[PDB]
């Protein structure tokens, strides 16, 4: 994730009710009882009616585009090969072929039909996570569900997808002792772990 906090509201004398904006995991909680020191000491002249509305939503990191795990539901598909035959006196063909037992590949001069192979062990499991080059046959929980801290706390369909699922357990707390800031209490990602408490 990146808790890209929108800048909180500070009403000086009285309440500012928050609304549940549609941002992913839009955590927002009104707070009173502040006295926000901002560059001149405090600035709101009340002392309890000083209101502070903190809001924070979850958003894809900039690394999400590039450094990102990637789940998959994996079926069986169809296997391939760049079969060389330095045939007979032909002495050469290096052709890409299939396995399904009626496909020819007339590259060179020979027509060749391969498979289907009997050894249907797809080393990929049904559910797979993928990361850069290291591929993990992991039972990823699902889109839309991943427990915060666990893998897939952020779950975006793709990189472009503005919608997502962010169970991060993002819980705002009130800022301390009349100062402007935004306590965001949050699990570091299940993408942070899964990079150093992962599987092989």
């Amino acid at each position: 994730y990146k808790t890209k906090v929108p800048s909180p509201v500070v009403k000086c004398c009285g309440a500012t009710q928050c609304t549940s904006k549609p941002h992913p995991d839009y955590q927002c909680q009104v707070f009173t009882g502040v006295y926000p020191f901002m560059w001149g000491g405090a600035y709101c002249f009340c002392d309890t009616e000083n209101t502070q509305m903190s809001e924070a939503y979850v958003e894809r990191s900039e690394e999400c585009s590039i450094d990102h795990a990637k789940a998959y539901k994996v079926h069986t598909g169809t296997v391939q090969a760049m079969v060389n035959i330095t045939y007979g006196s032909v002495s050469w063909r290096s052709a890409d072929v299939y396995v399904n037992g009626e496909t020819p590949a007339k590259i060179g001069d020979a027509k060749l039909i391969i498979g289907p192979l009997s050894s249907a062990w797809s080393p990929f499991d049904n559910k797979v996570v993928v990361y850069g080059h290291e591929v993990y046959n992991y039972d990823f929980p699902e889109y839309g569900t991943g427990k915060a801290g666990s893998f897939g706390d952020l779950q975006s369909r793709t990189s472009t997808s503005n919608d997502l699922y962010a169970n991060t357990n993002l819980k705002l707390q009130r800022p301390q002792a009349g100062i402007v800031h935004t306590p965001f209490t949050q699990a570091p990602s299940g993408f942070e772990r899964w990079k150093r408490d992962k599987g092989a």
Partner: protein, 342 residues
């Protein structure tokens, strides 16, 4: 072409926020550190100060230095920047509010320049590490070794891969304004800026004015010293008070995108291969903790994983068809162990 991101430069100002342990304690530093990102691999962190260094107020020289002093900027030279952590970091580049710097690991992050009269630093908590990409768990990038696809931030500015919202500032306090008109509390204005004013007593209730007086109240400590000065937008820090009026425009890029650089990267010393009957003894002796692992290529995989930092003679029951062997990010080996028992 340092003149291609006047999106930020002209239109954004050096924001000032509340640093958490600003030398003594919580000050309000212009270089207040938000969004520490020790998430790459190359010894690098991308940081945002609330201060917008780069060009000056107007038009010149990335390598100058504009923070906020007063309500005002101070667009001057960068002379003695210091990012640091457990050790002093190395700057990489600055653009906008944002700096990239090569740091070691550190429990915290600790930033600061030197204006010249004062140290005037800012410091923050953030868990930092630098694993290099590879099965070697170094603490630091070497001079040599294989290159392989790390995650890392750029040197450059000509960058659009993302953009963060940067709309207006809210007001700010400035009780330097609220002087006294020899019996009454006297507000003034920066340059005709919009000062939002009233006191606990009943007097002028909005304040959109030049320098006003205050008929009713007298004490400076019961009045609204405010600066609606939204001629330049800001970063939308959590340590910003909202500009209550509107979501003004000011969508503004990020320079330091995470990119797929191939870091100059790790390599673990070669193994000592030793033969036995369908068995690899391997006296082994790394530089750093190295994740070794294998794959007995039977349909029985029987793999193994163990980080090795302490030199260790290990063993591997190799089968008839083969095994493979991965001494860190050194490439994977392979081995025929047919018979040797005659």
């Amino acid at each position: 072409d340092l003149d291609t991101h006047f999106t930020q430069y002209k239109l954004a100002r050096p924001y000032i926020a509340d640093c958490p342990n600003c030398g003594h304690s919580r000050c309000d530093s212009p270089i207040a550190i938000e969004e520490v990102r020790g998430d790459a691999h190359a010894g690098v962190i991308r940081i945002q100060t609330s201060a917008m260094f780069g060009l000056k107020t107007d038009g010149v020289d990335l390598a100058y230095m504009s923070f906020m002093n007063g309500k005002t900027q101070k667009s001057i030279k960068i002379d003695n920047l210091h990012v640091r952590t457990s050790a002093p970091c190395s700057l990489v580049s600055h653009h906008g509010y944002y700096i990239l710097a090569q740091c070691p690991p550190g429990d915290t992050v600790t930033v600061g320049f030197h204006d010249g009269p004062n140290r005037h630093t800012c410091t923050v908590a953030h868990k930092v590490e630098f694993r290099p990409v590879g099965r070697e768990k170094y603490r630091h990038p070497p001079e040599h070794g294989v290159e392989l696809p790390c995650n890392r931030y750029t040197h450059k500015r000509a960058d659009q891969g993302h953009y963060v919202e940067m709309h207006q500032p809210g007001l700010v306090a400035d009780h330097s304004l609220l002087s006294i008109h020899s019996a009454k509390v006297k507000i003034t204005v920066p340059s005709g800026a919009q000062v939002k004013y009233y006191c606990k007593c009943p007097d002028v209730r909005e304040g959109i004015t030049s320098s006003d007086h205050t008929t009713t109240c007298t004490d400076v400590k019961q009045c609204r010293a405010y600066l609606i000065d939204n001629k330049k937008w800001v970063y939308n820090s959590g340590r910003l008070p909202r500009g209550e009026g509107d979501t003004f425009k000011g969508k503004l890029h990020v320079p330091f995108v995470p990119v797929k650089a191939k870091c100059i990267a790790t390599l673990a010393p070669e193994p000592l291969v030793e033969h036995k009957h369908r068995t690899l003894i391997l006296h082994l002796h790394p530089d750093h903790p190295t994740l070794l692992t294998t794959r007995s290529l039977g349909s029985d995989a029987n793999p193994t994983r163990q980080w090795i930092e302490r030199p260790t003679t290990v063993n591997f029951t190799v089968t008839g068809e083969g095994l493979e062997y991965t001494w860190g990010n050194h490439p994977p080996k392979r081995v025929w162990a047919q018979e040797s028992g005659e």
